[PDB]
Amino acid sequence: TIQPGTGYNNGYFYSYWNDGHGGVTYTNGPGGQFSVNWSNSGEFVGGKGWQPGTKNKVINFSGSYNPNGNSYLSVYGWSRNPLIEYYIVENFGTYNPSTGATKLGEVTSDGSVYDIYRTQRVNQPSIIGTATFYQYWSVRRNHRSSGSVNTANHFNAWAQQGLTLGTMDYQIVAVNGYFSSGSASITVS
Template sequence: MVSLKSLFLAIASVASVYAAPAEGVELVARADTGPVGYFSYWWTDGTANATYTSGAGGGYTITWSNNTGQFIGGKGWNPGTSTRVINYSGLYKPDGNSYLSVYGWTRNPLIEYYIVESYGPYNPSSAGTNKGSVNCNGASYDILQATRVNQPSIEGTKTFLQFWSVRNPKKTPGGSISGTITLSCHFNAWRSLGMLTGSSHAYQIVATGGSGPSGTSTITIA
């Protein structure tokens, strides 16, 4: 089992790639099933000054201030799927490093994936290798791949791949935000580039994450 201390040290050692939260005792204590039909998820590295509030239906709010740690939270489904069409809307106002994305995992093989709609000054996929691009829902997304070596994952400390689709240009943070994400468009594009996801899905959420000093994100999914 990955301890909270070792998890934080692993995160700190790889600042160029957003870390994978581990599915250990600490995570289970912070997760709940949320309203019927939605999976609610919340994780911090133990130093983040951030608060997660589960709202009605597919809604949630995360606020952070005087923050020096990392966090990620949101709502979605458990298990996920490669065919879901997700609609989201709300308010996304980060100050500093943050991102708003679909975030999930597959198993067999173990893959962590992000479909990033918006982010702060730092592109969270910056350490990845560019594999190409795809047009989905009327927007262009850069496709990248990164390798995480002996890092926390939903199966403990392992080496695994990260898949990224990053909207380019990103949706401008700092106010109202909304959109539609057709997951099959991204999964098919990854597959066409030899980026094969796993045979089974773990959780899949519309997430707000980051490490910036302050901000607020109030998002509703459907």
């Protein structure tokens, strides 16, 4: 079990963040493996991957994802200049993160269609401090907890629709949570 923060474990970059509310335990395991157990958490996100990401990485993931409430399983990361928080959402709990959001396209990739959206966070935490910034989403229609993600298909589709990315910062397979409970065990490569 580890502190919120970033670093490397068994060859993989990890990032683990929470809002200080408690109720979340994040564990690094062998190789590309990590687990998350949470109960009446606040806001958090953690996982394993790369620092920096690339714009054509093929990300593989496998495991078990059992949210009880608001939670996502995604390819998650950031760009700088412009500052963008992005998600390729493979599964989720009680809330589709695109609810109420403007649909800006579709993309077929890795066995499913995905719907593309853009949202905005206002004076929220980020990799550069409190800021206002856009979020890009691909939301998979066919939910799963194992597979491969050809990231170039999403980044290219986003760019086509006017959702461009800057320089890549980190890029991980992550479990997100917002005031919820659950467990998950995921292996990345």
